[PDB]
């Protein structure tokens, strides 16, 4: 009851799990000792944090937070350090320790020493594109990695089949503006114009019969997230499924 602490954990699925604890000043405790401090002629507190440490709770383990920290001391404030976890596959809720050491202060003496440790479980918990018919999974072998400079480049759509008639389908890009609150008309028009006119796909109806190369050229700039347009089409009626994947800044 001097410094309220909370830990927030965010699940970055393309990397490690990120969890950050957060100290604060706990105002419902500060006016308490503010009353006696301004009784003794002091305006704000001088609590000194001298040893702050998060340890990985286990039989025994410890971690290290993902940037640098000094030995600090603040009056009415909040600080928050971040430490990276390891992104679990399924069903193992890890736990942490989070010890701390607040050192209070008085007139060049009487440093009433305090310490605190709140151990709890660090599990807040709130690119394969499947075919959705017969598990013909597609993945780009270098997705989201392309700094092109309006030059040619090549990608790799590694199709993974049932190995049962593995020669079936054809890619294409569809350079055509799709035909679609008036600025909601205009934002959709600018999105559909920059999608259907910015890159070209130099191997158009490539008719793949399990890698591909798919050379593009890319004649306008801007971050093309999710790279729409690049559809495939298969032996059945309409397997017009997307890739929905891969991105390229073009500057």
């Amino acid at each position: 009851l001097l410094n309220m602490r909370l830990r927030n954990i965010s699940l970055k699925s393309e990397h490690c799990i990120l969890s950050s604890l957060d100290f604060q000043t706990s105002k419902a405790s500060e006016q308490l000792t503010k009353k006696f401090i301004y009784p003794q002629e002091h305006n704000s507190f001088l609590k000194l944090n001298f040893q702050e440490i998060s340890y990985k709770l286990i039989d025994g383990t410890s971690q290290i937070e993902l940037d640098p920290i000094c030995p600090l001391k603040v009056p009415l404030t909040a600080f928050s350090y971040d430490s990276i976890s390891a992104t679990f596959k399924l069903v193992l809720l890890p736990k942490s320790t989070q010890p701390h050491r607040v050192k209070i202060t008085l007139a060049y003496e009487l440093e009433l020493h305090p310490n605190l440790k709140l151990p709890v479980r660090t599990s807040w918990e709130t690119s394969l594109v499947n075919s959705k018919l017969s598990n013909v999974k597609f993945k780009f072998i270098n997705s989201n990695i392309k700094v092109i400079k309006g030059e040619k480049f090549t990608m790799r759509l590694q199709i993974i089949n049932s190995s049962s008639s593995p020669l079936d389908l054809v890619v294409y890009y569809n350079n055509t503006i799709n035909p679609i609150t008036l600025e909601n008309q205009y934002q959709l028009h600018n999105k559909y114009r920059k999608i259907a006119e910015g890159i070209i796909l130099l191997s158009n109806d490539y008719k793949i019969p399990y890698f591909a190369d798919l050379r593009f050229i890319g004649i306008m700039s801007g971050y093309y997230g999710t790279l729409s347009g690049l559809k495939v089409l298969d032996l059945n009626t309409n397997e017009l499924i997307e890739v929905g994947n891969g991105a390229s800044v073009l500057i």
Binding site: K12, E14, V74, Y81
Partner: protein, 282 residues
């Protein structure tokens, strides 16, 4: 027009709006007409005076019928010599109940009656009789403002002869607060995922209250979210406020809330309360 107050301020205003390329800048109660004014401050800091707006507006309902009056039924100066003169207030008791088409006057269809009562109104010739260049020639002009509705018949050409110039002139408060200080936080980004190509919104503030607060929000990211933890390092210059953050996470509910409910506060050094924050992630 916005102008100076009644003191010796001499503020270097440069923004204005006179209708200089049109004379007819319309408006229809659903769109904006945003008017912007650059009031640059003089040799001292900008004070707390009361300024004065000057708007020379007019309603549309007198303008549109001038071609229904001074063109349709006052063509010849002998046909409008005495026919209009003895029944001008009878015409102004006739045209005041016109009830024009101000429901579809956005796209087209200016100068049409919107069918209030078109057929019963021609009985006025019976109980009062005047010159037939008005008493018999303007009912055809009443049909010529019933049908024949021009979408834009260059209405600024026949406007200035009969349009009255109303002029509202409201005040202008220059309403503000009074606490000047500064800040400069500095930052250095720590890698999460990959650099997402961060883009800046702004940095400025203005506040005065009791147990006063100054909240800030971060920049704007346009890659995949949950992005890089910005590590920050303060230079809380020219005052002694109260910090509340260290090394936040730039696509989240975190906010570097540098509050200021404290002392070391100069007053009225600029146009308002101001504290130029100017965060630097370099």
């Amino acid at each position: 027009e916005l102008s100076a107050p009644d003191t010796r301020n001499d503020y270097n205003i440069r923004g204005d709006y006179i209708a200089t390329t049109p004379a007819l800048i319309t408006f229809d109660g659903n769109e904006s007409f945003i008017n912007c004014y650059e009031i640059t401050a003089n040799n001292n800091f900008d004070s707390k005076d009361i300024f004065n707006l000057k708007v020379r507006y007019n309603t549309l309902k007198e303008q549109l019928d001038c071609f229904i009056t001074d063109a349709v039924l006052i063509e010849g100066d002998v046909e409008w010599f005495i026919l209009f003169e003895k029944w001008k207030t009878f015409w102004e008791l006739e045209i005041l109940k016109k009830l024009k088409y101000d429901y579809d006057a956005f796209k087209e269809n200016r100068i049409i009656r919107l069918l209030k009562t078109s057929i019963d109104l021609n009985k006025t010739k019976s109980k009062i009789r005047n010159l037939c260049i008005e008493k018999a020639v303007l009912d055809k002009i009443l049909i010529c403002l019933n049908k024949v509705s021009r979408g834009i018949a260059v209405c600024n050409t026949d406007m200035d002869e009969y349009v009255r110039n109303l002029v509202p002139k409201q005040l202008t408060v220059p309403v503000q607060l009074p606490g000047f200080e500064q800040f400069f936080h500095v930052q250095f980004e720590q890698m999460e995922t990959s650099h997402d190509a961060l883009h800046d919104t702004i940095a400025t503030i203005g506040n005065s209250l009791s147990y006063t607060v100054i909240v800030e929000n971060l920049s704007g990211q346009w890659g995949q979210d949950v992005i890089d933890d910005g590590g920050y390092i303060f230079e809380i210059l020219s005052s002694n406020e109260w910090l509340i953050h260290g090394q936040k996470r730039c696509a989240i509910k975190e906010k570097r809330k540098e509050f200021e409910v404290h002392l070391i506060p100069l007053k009225k050094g600029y146009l308002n309360f101001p504290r130029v924050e100017i965060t630097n992630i370099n």
